[PDB]
Amino acid sequence: MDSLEKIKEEVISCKKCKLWQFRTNAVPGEGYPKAEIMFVGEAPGENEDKEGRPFVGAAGKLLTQMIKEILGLERDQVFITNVVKCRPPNNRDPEEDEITACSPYLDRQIDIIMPKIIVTLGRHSTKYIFSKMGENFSSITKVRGKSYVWKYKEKEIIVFPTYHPAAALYNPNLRKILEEDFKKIRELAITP
Ligand code: SF4
């Protein structure tokens, strides 16, 4: 039967799409298997590729700070991954065939974890999860900052799209919006 350990083993040696040829390390994701909050980013950047870990660049440091200061959580208490788990060449966006190849890993991670909340960081992860939900995706600007109920198996999962933290690094206005969004995520997390 499936497990997060099995998914990690498969990802680390995966050659299911052409992205494998460009990587230093695949990035399977990390965190608590019973996380109430699951964060899903786009694809690994350069530092993520180097470390084999999600959100470790400057952007990841900001994410960590927001999780700590606004949500009141350590990274070990949440689960963090990416819709595509290898760094696209020259940091381009992932192709549709790459998302198709890799996203079953994310499906399997969600299946196992069944978080209360999935926070989709950026337009690619948001569009992907919306496609799985059957929810209409317009743009990240139009859908961010709202909760969407995803009836999934026996449970309800709250999907909360926001901007990717890298977008907030050098943009004070967008960072305040991201912070406000994390405040809303906090309220959702603590409310029965
Ligand atoms: S991006 Fe995903 S599907 Fe493609 S090689 Fe890496 S782990 Fe496999």
UniProtKB/Swiss-Prot annotation:
Uracil binds at residues 41-43, 55, 82, 164. SUPFAM superfamilies: Uracil-DNA glycosylase-like (SSF52141). InterPro entries: Type-4_UDG, UDG_Type-4/5, Ura-DNA_glyco_family4, Uracil-DNA_glycosylase-like, Uracil-DNA_glycosylase-like_sf. [4Fe-4S] cluster binds at residues 14, 17, 86, 102. The keyword Protein biosynthesis does not apply. It catalyses: Hydrolyzes single-stranded DNA or mismatched double-stranded DNA and polynucleotides, releasing free uracil. It is an enzyme of class 3 (hydrolase). GO terms for biological process: DNA repair. Keywords: 4Fe-4S, DNA damage, DNA repair, Hydrolase, Iron, Iron-sulfur, Metal-binding. Removes uracil bases that are present in DNA as a result of either deamination of cytosine or misincorporation of dUMP instead of dTMP. Belongs to the uracil-DNA glycosylase (UDG) superfamily. Type 4 (UDGa) family. This is Type-4 uracil-DNA glycosylase. It comes from Sulfurisphaera tokodaii (strain DSM 16993 / JCM 10545 / NBRC 100140 / 7) (Sulfolobus tokodaii).
